[PDB]
């Protein structure tokens, strides 16, 4: 295998190859121009691995040309999804607590360096400086105990074989205290919807039925027409005005010509989940939100009572099955709470996802909103709903190809080496290379 190079090699290559005005490197003047056609791609990886405001420094692997023509970042950011949502909920809490508790928040100047300023060298201006404190909310050592040791690492439990596999960082396996702690760290970014009966006329198939017709929903998206002596008005009882949502709820019965219409899932059994307040109360008790039973019956039915002189007694070696075990532990109510939880948090184990592929604010624009809000945010929620419907509609399946691996074919050549570098150093390199 081609192995990692010392990080000073690419550094001195970029330092010697300056503004490419030296005569000595004129033979490389051609090569750099060709590397221009990969500068979009080298941009993408550069911004794909941006380091996450709870991080001070991220070291990324770098695939670099031997002349210093280009620097690619050869890494996909796998970010395990419950930990990612908990960390951004932590960021949400800290930023609200900072913006309320700061006398004057000075905004950054957005052309940060001046136009005629040459870019700063990493090796002297940045390499020796201690970075800063990151954001990284203070965690309770007793209440946030199974999370506190690893919660603000880059790829947190990576070298622990009990919780993930290896260093490819692909499959995670947590415990229910970990999932409980990640769940109550992320309450600021999650919802309180236990069942999807909220989305009766406001879900995906309903919006497809709306786009197939000319109908809009009052809190939903608006589209373009997909198609662009019987109904006598003295023969029709207009008793109730035909409310427009009937055309979604029952599409064939209330319209003529329902072409390209989608059927709607219309009811789930109402999930009735009692949220417990304190652990002083037991795990499952009769909650005072539940209506009592109070049995009443008129005449007693003759249910069987095998009376005395039946002489049926149990043997000595028999007991109730699990009377040795207690009825409930301190982790029972938390696990029942983890049963009705959003899709990352309702499970023990899964497969890692990219930082790209995790929408933090998707559940916020998917629900309809309380009217007290301004006009601006209502139009914005409607447009984001329209974007979600256009994403879900024109989804052709992934079309299984032959895998191509551009960066594996670059580092199989003799023109590319590989190292590991600070993200800020590679970003300064990419800016100098594109310039």
């Amino acid at each position: 295998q081609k192995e990692d190079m010392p990080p000073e090699h690419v550094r001195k290559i970029i330092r010697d190859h300056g503004d490419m005005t030296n005569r000595k490197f004129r033979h490389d003047k051609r090569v750099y121009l060709g590397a221009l056609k990969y500068m979009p791609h080298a941009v993408l990886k550069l911004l794909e691995n941006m380091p996450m405001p709870w991080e001070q420094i991220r070291d990324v692997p770098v695939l670099y040309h031997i002349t210093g023509a280009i620097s690619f970042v050869n890494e996909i950011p796998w970010v395990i999804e419950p930990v990612y949502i908990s960390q951004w909920g932590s960021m949400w809490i800290m930023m609200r607590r900072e913006k309320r508790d700061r006398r004057h928040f000075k905004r950054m100047r957005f052309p940060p360096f001046d136009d005629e300023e040459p870019p700063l060298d990493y090796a002297d201006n940045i390499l020796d400086v201690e970075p800063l404190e990151a954001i990284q909310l203070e965690l309770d050592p007793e209440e946030d105990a199974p999370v506190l040791d690893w919660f603000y690492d880059h790829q947190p439990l990576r070298d622990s074989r009990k919780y993930v596999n290896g260093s490819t960082y692909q499959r995670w396996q947590f415990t229910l205290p970990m999932m409980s702690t990640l769940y109550r760290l992320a309450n600021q970014l999650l919802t309180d919807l236990v069942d999807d009966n909220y989305f009766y006329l406001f879900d995906l198939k309903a919006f497809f039925t709306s786009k197939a017709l000319n109908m809009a929903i009052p809190g939903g998206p608006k589209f373009e027409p997909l198609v662009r002596e019987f109904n006598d008005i003295n023969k029709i009882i207009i008793r109730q005005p035909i409310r427009t949502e009937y055309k979604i709820a029952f599409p064939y019965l209330y319209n003529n010509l329902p072409h390209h219409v989608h059927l709607t899932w219309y009811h789930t059994p109402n999930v009735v989940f009692i949220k417990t307040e304190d652990p002083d109360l037991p795990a499952f008790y009769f909650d005072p939100l539940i209506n009592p039973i109070s049995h009443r019956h008129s005449v007693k039915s003759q249910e069987p009572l095998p009376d005395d002189d039946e002489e049926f007694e149990l043997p000595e070696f028999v007991e109730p099955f699990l009377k040795d075990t207690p009825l409930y532990t301190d982790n029972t109510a938390n696990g029942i709470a983890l049963l009705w939880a959003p899709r990352p948090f309702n499970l023990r184990s899964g497969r890692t996802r990219r930082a790209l592929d995790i929408p933090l604010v998707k559940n916020w624009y998917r629900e309809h909103c309380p009217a007290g809000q301004p006009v601006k945010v209502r139009v914005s929620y409607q447009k984001l709903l329209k974007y979600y419907v256009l994403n879900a509609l024109k989804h052709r399946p992934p079309k299984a190809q032959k895998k191509r691996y551009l960066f594996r074919s670059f580092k199989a050549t003799k023109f590319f080496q590989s190292t590991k570098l600070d993200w800020v150093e590679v970003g300064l390199q990419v800016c100098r290379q594109g310039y």
């Binding site: 009966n197 023969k235 035909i242």
Partner: protein
């Protein structure tokens, strides 16, 4: 004679008042508002007109954000309060007529429908 529909709605507590409003806007007369024993949801049993019951489910689940849920069976026939034969009352073309002449309106519409 008008057909009526027996409607059972399962709903949360503020949705009980929401069901009461939506069902009372359709000449309702809610029959029973008993709770469910062993559940925090309430059962609302009621009668409804069956001309007023085209989309009561959809309107109800829209107004209650999908919390309340409604089903409807046929069991009943009782008298339309209007005078079915009345030449004094003139029926408007499109405007919905009130209670004193609903039978006249419905008879004129069914007369114009097939029989003449």
């Amino acid at each position: 004679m008008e057909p009526y529909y027996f409607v059972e709605v399962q709903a949360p507590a503020d949705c009980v008042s929401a069901v009461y409003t939506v069902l009372a806007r359709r000449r309702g007369h809610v029959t029973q508002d008993a709770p469910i024993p062993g559940s925090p949801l309430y059962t609302i049993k009621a009668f409804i007109p069956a001309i007023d019951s085209f989309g009561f489910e959809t309107d109800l689940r829209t107004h209650t954000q999908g919390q309340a849920f409604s089903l409807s069976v046929f069991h009943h026939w009782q008298i339309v309060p209007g005078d079915p034969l009345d030449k004094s009352i003139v029926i408007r073309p499109l405007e919905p007529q009130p209670a004193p002449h609903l039978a006249r309106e419905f008879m004129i519409k069914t007369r114009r429908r097939k029989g003449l």
